[PDB]
Every structure is written in structure tokens, then in C-alpha cells.
Design a protein around this ligand. Sequence first.
Ligand SMILES: CCCCCC(=O)N[C@H]1CCOC1=O
Ligand SMILES: CCCCCC(=O)N[C@H]1CCOC1=O
Lengths: 178, 178
Amino acid sequence: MRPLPAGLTASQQWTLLEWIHMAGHIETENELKAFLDQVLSQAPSERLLLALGRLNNQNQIQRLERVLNVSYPSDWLDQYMKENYAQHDPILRIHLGQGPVMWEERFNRAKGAEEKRFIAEATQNGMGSGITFSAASERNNIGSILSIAGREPGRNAALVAMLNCLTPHLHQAAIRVA
Amino acid sequence: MRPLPAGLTASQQWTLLEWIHMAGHIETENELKAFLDQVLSQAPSERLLLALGRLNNQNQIQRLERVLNVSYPSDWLDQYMKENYAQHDPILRIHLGQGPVMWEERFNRAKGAEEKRFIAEATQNGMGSGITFSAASERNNIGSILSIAGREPGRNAALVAMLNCLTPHLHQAAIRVA
Ligand SMILES: CCCCCC(=O)N[C@H]1CCOC1=O
Ligand SMILES: CCCCCC(=O)N[C@H]1CCOC1=O
């Protein structure tokens, strides 16, 4: 269990409380999307996606079970699927449950030609910067990622901490929905 | 989704946040009992029990699926089972999800001879006063009750509100455990 954030204002504390309270009442994909729309409305980004995956023994996604696009450009997602970027996207290689991953930091460390190709393409599509939160359940090797694209979220330490803490509850909701 | 309480102090708000955060990480009966022990340590009672039940079409328990005794006297539970009090206990007739039920108020309204007998017996065993919180999921007609015995909890409006809000999350945890 990841620790709750220190240094939140009463307003931020209340927002987080509302978010985790709401998340625990999510039963349907409809409710899940509606809730993510609400969370999105509080972040300095316009691009959010949640995915659920079956994991390997190192807590990496080996199979995508559900992709819930909230506000990624549909053209980018279409390209991602069509061009099989799942095989080249460094974000899908994260060890889930090991802490928030900043994309620019992860991208700068990539070495493969195909990975660099993907990064260049993501960059042209306004996806060069962002953050991915994650949670995993070894009850049945299942995990979730919450991705938010942009530079501003990562610079808001409180928001990062809030979304990070929300993530395990979104994970439980996603499992219920699936 | 029941509304979060108004008028909590920052400390009470933080406690509630910790409780719902912790509840969403519960995966095992062990963890569930340990967490309920923690919650118990914050209430002016020493007697707590959680139960999960399959419901009828009016959201009343028709079958008990799991009874997790945290701190009811074992002698009282033994008697309850042995004497089949489930059939006579007004608390097991609550419509789950319809708000916290104060036992003294519910008991005062009982009319049946067997119900009155049970009430008299509960009273002698220090169970004449208390409160039961509840939540229900019509996904599969399943609900939970959280019972706390004593007079002091009901007199602490903040605690009542906090435990009430925690209940749906304990319910989801109980479903995961079962
Ligand atoms: C469609 C699944 C993609 C989930 C992983 C993710 O958010 N990947 C970022 C990295 C840059 O571009 C993306 O789409
Ligand atoms: C063993 C299941 C009992 C759950 C319902 C409950 O908490 N009933 C109270 C009412 C007075 O005595 C009790 O045990």
C-alpha cells in the first residue's frame, strides 16, 4: 500500500478523498469513463488513458485486457494499434507497481532503433511528455496503468501524488468493470 | 454513492482518507480482520462484527455468506447461532443500503414475542444498544453489514458519519475476500 501524500492543502485532501470514495463505487465502464472525465477536469492535461493487462512474472504487461481511452486523440490510438507500437512503446515495458514513470526520463534512456522510431513519432503527435501511474494485483497477475500526456502534470507534485494514490483504486474499479 | 460527511476536523478527514485508502488494498481475510482491529481501536466500543449476505428483492439478507467476528463475545455468537437468533434479530431484517440503523430505536418498535425475547436476551448480554451500517450491490444481490455494539458510538456524530462512509468500501473488500 503506497503511502498517502504529505503537504496537501485541505482542498486537495478533500479532492483525493472524493476521488477514492467515488472510485470505490464504480461498477460499470460507463461510470468508470465518467469518473475519469471528472479526474481529467482537474489536471493540466487533456489526454488520459487507462489500461488493464495480464502480467508476466516481473509485473510487466504481457497481454492487454482492456484499453479505456478517455481523451487520447483517436488518430493517435488508431496509428498505435495499426503500427503495432505496443511492441516498441517503452511505457508498456514498465514494471507495474514500481512507482510513477516520467516519459521524458524513460524515453531519453531508450537504445533500440524501433524504440527511437516510436519515440520520434510519439513526439510529433504531442505524446513526447507525460506520466504513467500503475498498480498490480498478484491475486491473478493483473495490473493497470493510468497514463496522462503533457508536461504540466509532472510539474505539479501534489497532483502527481494524488493521482498516484488514486491509481490502486482505479485498478480495483477496472477489475470490477472487466 | 453516499455523500462524504460535513464538519470533520482535518484529523478526522485524514483518518477517513486512511481508512478508505487501506480498505481498497484489502485482499485477504487476514488483512480484513487486521484492518477492522485498527478501525475498532478508534471507536468508543469494543464489539464489532462484519457480515456478508445474499439479498432478497428488498435488499434484506436471505442467506449469510460470511460472518467475520472482530470482537463480539464468542459466548454471545455461540448462543446466537445455537439458538437460531438470525430468525428473530431485527437487525438482520434491515433493508441494506437504506442508512445507519440505531438498535435501541429499532428494538423499541419490535412487536413479535420471539423478537422481544431476543431483545431481552441481547440486552442481558450487553447488546441492547448499538448501530449497524450497510451497503448493497445489485450486481449480484450481495450486501454487507457492519455492526458496532454500545451507546457511545451513536452519540459521536462524526464517527457515525465516518464509519457509514467507510462501509461501502468494507463491502467491496469483503466481496474480494469471499
Ligand atoms: C494504447 C496503450 C498505450 C498505453 C501506454 C502509453 O500511454 N504510452 C504513451 C507513450 C507515448 O505515447 C503513448 O501513447
Ligand atoms: C451474527 C450476526 C449478527 C449480525 C446482526 C447484529 O449485529 N445483531 C445484533 C443485535 C443485538 O445483538 C446482535 O448480535
